[PDB]
Design an enzyme around this catalytic site. Sequence first.
Site, PDB file in Angstrom:
ATOM      1  N   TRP C  13       0.840  -1.196   0.000  1.00 54.96           N
ATOM      2  CA  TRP C  13       0.000   0.000   0.000  1.00 54.96           C
ATOM      3  C   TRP C  13       0.881   1.255   0.000  1.00 54.96           C
ATOM      4  CZ3 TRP C  13      -5.469  -1.017   0.593  1.00 54.96           C
ATOM      5  CH2 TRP C  13      -6.272   0.136   0.480  1.00 54.96           C
ATOM      6  N   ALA C  45      -1.045  -3.382   5.674  1.00 53.16           N
ATOM      7  CA  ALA C  45      -0.326  -3.428   6.947  1.00 53.16           C
ATOM      8  C   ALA C  45      -0.917  -4.446   7.935  1.00 53.16           C
ATOM      9  CB  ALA C  45      -0.254  -2.036   7.577  1.00 53.16           C
ATOM     10  N   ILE C  46      -2.238  -4.639   7.887  1.00 50.46           N
ATOM     11  CA  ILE C  46      -2.944  -5.614   8.735  1.00 50.46           C
ATOM     12  C   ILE C  46      -2.383  -7.038   8.575  1.00 50.46           C
ATOM     13  CG2 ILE C  46      -5.219  -6.631   9.352  1.00 50.46           C
ATOM     14  CD1 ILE C  46      -5.448  -3.740   9.908  1.00 50.46           C
ATOM     15  N   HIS C  75     -10.850   5.442  10.081  1.00 53.33           N
ATOM     16  CA  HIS C  75     -10.247   4.181   9.637  1.00 53.33           C
ATOM     17  C   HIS C  75      -8.738   4.112   9.909  1.00 53.33           C
ATOM     18  CE1 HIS C  75     -10.437   0.478   7.141  1.00 53.33           C
ATOM     19  NE2 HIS C  75      -9.214   0.825   6.781  1.00 53.33           N
TER      20      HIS C  75
HETATM   21  O1  LIG Z   1      -0.937  -0.336   4.658  1.00 55.39           O
HETATM   22  C1  LIG Z   1      -2.040   0.244   4.640  1.00 55.39           C
HETATM   23  N1  LIG Z   1      -2.062   1.594   4.721  1.00 55.39           N
HETATM   24  C2  LIG Z   1      -3.231   2.264   4.705  1.00 55.39           C
HETATM   25  O2  LIG Z   1      -3.248   3.509   4.781  1.00 55.39           O
HETATM   26  C3  LIG Z   1      -4.495   1.489   4.596  1.00 55.39           C
HETATM   27  N2  LIG Z   1      -5.792   1.862   4.555  1.00 55.39           N
HETATM   28  C4  LIG Z   1      -6.441   0.695   4.454  1.00 55.39           C
HETATM   29  O3  LIG Z   1      -7.723   0.658   4.388  1.00 55.39           O
HETATM   30  N3  LIG Z   1      -5.673  -0.398   4.429  1.00 55.39           N
HETATM   31  C5  LIG Z   1      -6.161  -1.786   4.315  1.00 55.39           C
HETATM   32  C6  LIG Z   1      -5.207  -2.895   4.790  1.00 55.39           C
HETATM   33  O4  LIG Z   1      -4.594  -2.563   6.044  1.00 55.39           O
HETATM   34  C7  LIG Z   1      -5.859  -4.285   4.887  1.00 55.39           C
HETATM   35  O5  LIG Z   1      -5.447  -5.041   3.742  1.00 55.39           O
HETATM   36  C8  LIG Z   1      -7.392  -4.289   5.019  1.00 55.39           C
HETATM   37  O6  LIG Z   1      -7.775  -3.917   6.349  1.00 55.39           O
HETATM   38  C9  LIG Z   1      -8.038  -5.635   4.665  1.00 55.39           C
HETATM   39  O7  LIG Z   1      -7.869  -6.609   5.710  1.00 55.39           O
HETATM   40  C10 LIG Z   1      -4.415   0.092   4.514  1.00 55.39           C
HETATM   41  N4  LIG Z   1      -3.180  -0.488   4.539  1.00 55.39           N
END
Ligand SMILES: O=c1[nH]c(=O)c2[nH]c(=O)n(C[C@@H](O)[C@H](O)[C@H](O)CO)c2[nH]1
Lengths: 146, 147, 146, 147, 147
Positions: C13, C45-46, C75
Amino acid sequence: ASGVRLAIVASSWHGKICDALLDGARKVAAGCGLDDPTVVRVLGAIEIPVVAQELARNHDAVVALGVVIRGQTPHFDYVCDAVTQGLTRVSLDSSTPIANGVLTTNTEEQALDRAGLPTSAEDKGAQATVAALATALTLRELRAHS
Amino acid sequence: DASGVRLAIVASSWHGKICDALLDGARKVAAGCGLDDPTVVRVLGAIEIPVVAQELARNHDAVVALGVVIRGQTPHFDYVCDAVTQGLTRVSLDSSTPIANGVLTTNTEEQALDRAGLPTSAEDKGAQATVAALATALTLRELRAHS
Amino acid sequence: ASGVRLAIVASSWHGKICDALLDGARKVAAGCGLDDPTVVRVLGAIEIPVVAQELARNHDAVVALGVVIRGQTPHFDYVCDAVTQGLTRVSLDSSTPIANGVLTTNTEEQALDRAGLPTSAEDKGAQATVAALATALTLRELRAHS
Amino acid sequence: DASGVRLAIVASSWHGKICDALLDGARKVAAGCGLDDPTVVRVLGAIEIPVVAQELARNHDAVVALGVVIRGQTPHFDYVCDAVTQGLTRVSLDSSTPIANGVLTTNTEEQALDRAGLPTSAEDKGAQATVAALATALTLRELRAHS
Amino acid sequence: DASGVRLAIVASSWHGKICDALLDGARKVAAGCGLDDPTVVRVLGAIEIPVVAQELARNHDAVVALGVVIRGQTPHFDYVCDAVTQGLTRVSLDSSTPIANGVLTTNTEEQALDRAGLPTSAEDKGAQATVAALATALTLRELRAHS
Ligand SMILES: O=c1[nH]c(=O)c2[nH]c(=O)n(C[C@@H](O)[C@H](O)[C@H](O)CO)c2[nH]1
Ligand SMILES: O=c1[nH]c(=O)c2[nH]c(=O)n(C[C@@H](O)[C@H](O)[C@H](O)CO)c2[nH]1
Ligand SMILES: O=c1[nH]c(=O)c2[nH]c(=O)n(C[C@@H](O)[C@H](O)[C@H](O)CO)c2[nH]1
Ligand SMILES: O=c1[nH]c(=O)c2[nH]c(=O)n(C[C@@H](O)[C@H](O)[C@H](O)CO)c2[nH]1
Ligand SMILES: O=c1[nH]c(=O)c2[nH]c(=O)n(C[C@@H](O)[C@H](O)[C@H](O)CO)c2[nH]1
Ligand SMILES: [K+]
Ligand SMILES: [K+]
Ligand SMILES: [K+]
Ligand SMILES: [K+]
Ligand SMILES: [K+]
Ligand SMILES: [K+]
Ligand SMILES: [K+]
Ligand SMILES: [K+]
Ligand SMILES: [K+]
């Protein structure tokens, strides 16, 4: 509530208020038929949960007492977060009621008003002990006997 | 007195001066309580503290954590502190050992200096944290099993 | 530092910044004698905690790199909360340092300035790797030998 | 390929239109990746998601959680989103299985529509959450033991 | 027809009238669902709920938690809600049992009254929690082993 084993652990940061909170706790116990419970002192609020973990291996109920007042740094938030996490994790690990009687206030007058002093409006130290003792008696009815 | 307790101090290096002041005050309390040479370990940041403290826990009666976290222009301040909170609290209950939190959380650099125990500081949190750990170690000994 | 097993797990991301982070980590690995670390990519990141949990099984240190930027909804807060709780729980289950090199900023210009680009202020990707290597080397001297 | 992975999806019911829109995007991605009929289970609220996700993890390689929580007038919003954040994080590490977080947190209803994958939406989080789960599973497959 | 399920209800007493209103709605849903006599236990406060719910889980298929937390003059509000959130979430996963969260958290007393299910209230969250617990229990029954 004559046959219930009770323990109390109280911190020492802000001495005057803590002594008031411990006083309400002791008075509730004696009126409920419990002479001399186990009373343990600690320095700060963060050291409470590790002492309650030890006390829960010998008692039916634990009452934790403290005072945390807001300063000028975000330090307030983190001292209270630990106590929340710690006590909740001790309660479910040992299947024992841990009553939270730790005050979290903005000004020190608020902390004085909830300790049970001559001119206070409240004594949450007394409330906490009633909370622990009633729960202990409930668990005894719900468990294996007779 | 506290002559018979095993104590460890772990301190980070982010902001040299303040960290060196926190370690100084912690060492002075240890010496005054009968403990001449405790186990002192240095790490880079505050996030590395819990994992090193877990190692010290299986050989010591008391662990003291020292550091400084100052607020910047990103919410990065919040989550550095959140890590230290959850880490030190879980370590303490897994090992049944008191872990002192002596990591400063301040808005400005002045505030951090004022609570570090320097020549003209208002207080010393590093000294406070070490008193918290030794006293809680002595209490657990009385509560626990002895002849 | 040459005897250290090093794994790096980088998110995808915001691609441009992630690749700047990852190359900062590469340079400080190669400079400390470690020519070829285990590099794994993930999307969000999750998904970092679960992959780091696997990589901890045969490495001395894990570095986690990513970017989280704030939007119009709360979020942002919950993405960071998950990353905080995960890596903290992964480090303590496996007794392995897991370096937190995930950037959390308000605007995108901030996240660029901390990536280690030609005219940026500093590089957190390199800082996080030094954090992991040193802590690994610390745990080595403390542990059993010889 | 990517057709060897067994996938489970759990979606809450609170707010009718949006949850169905999230599940649709999730279903599209799975079929496009070779997975025609994944395990779909419905719950009432977002708080009930973790406990069903714990059950599905016992014979699936990846689980996708979907839902919507919109802010009201009381601080209720904060505590529904805490339980979801804490619950799924515990489940993912307990079972060593990716659990994708596709539960929306918005200040308005128009925000939650715009991120659900509707005919005029700006993006679709249900599709993103499923991709995240399948990719992570395939990565774990490669890292783990095979002949 | 949920006549098979073993249901427990635990309701705190702080703010007497509202806690009676919550429990009345919960009893009525249970009674309409074919469950005549559930296990009803009272406690003093909301912090006291998780530990009583943990004991109830050893003998029931679902547990319903009921209570009221109204904001005061001190940050006390956040912390009472935090403990309920952490406790219940950990209990549900430890025991693999749905624990319905019907503990109200409001800014005014007039708001807690409106969601309790009195003669002129907008909604009844006590009834909503029971429907959540019973439906999830029947689902886990369908998903788990049976001949
Ligand atoms: O790395 C991320 N940065 C963000 O700003 C951002 N915003 C966002 O919605 N996600 C999603 C990601 O962490 C996950 O793949 C998602 O929660 C699906 O499980 C992420 N991931
Ligand atoms: O259920 C509660 N609602 C409140 O608004 C409130 N305010 C308050 O101080 N308590 C105390 C209660 O949660 C516990 O009995 C006590 O905190 C545990 O020792 C409670 N309990
Ligand atoms: O009970 C406390 N109330 C406060 O307002 C306050 N402020 C404060 O800094 N402490 C120290 C205490 O939380 C810990 O013992 C200390 O962090 C050492 O680990 C305390 N303790
Ligand atoms: O002690 C620190 N104080 C800070 O304000 C601060 N800001 C910051 O980014 N770090 C780095 C530290 O938390 C870790 O070493 C780093 O996250 C690498 O994992 C630190 N460390
Ligand atoms: O999915 C939900 N979104 C919300 O905004 C919201 N608000 C709300 O009160 N619930 C109820 C749900 O979390 C639970 O089923 C309920 O608390 C019973 O345990 C939900 N569920
Ligand atoms: K006990
Ligand atoms: K019984
Ligand atoms: K020890
Ligand atoms: K003894
Ligand atoms: K390892
Ligand atoms: K050694
Ligand atoms: K699995
Ligand atoms: K492999
Ligand atoms: K059960």
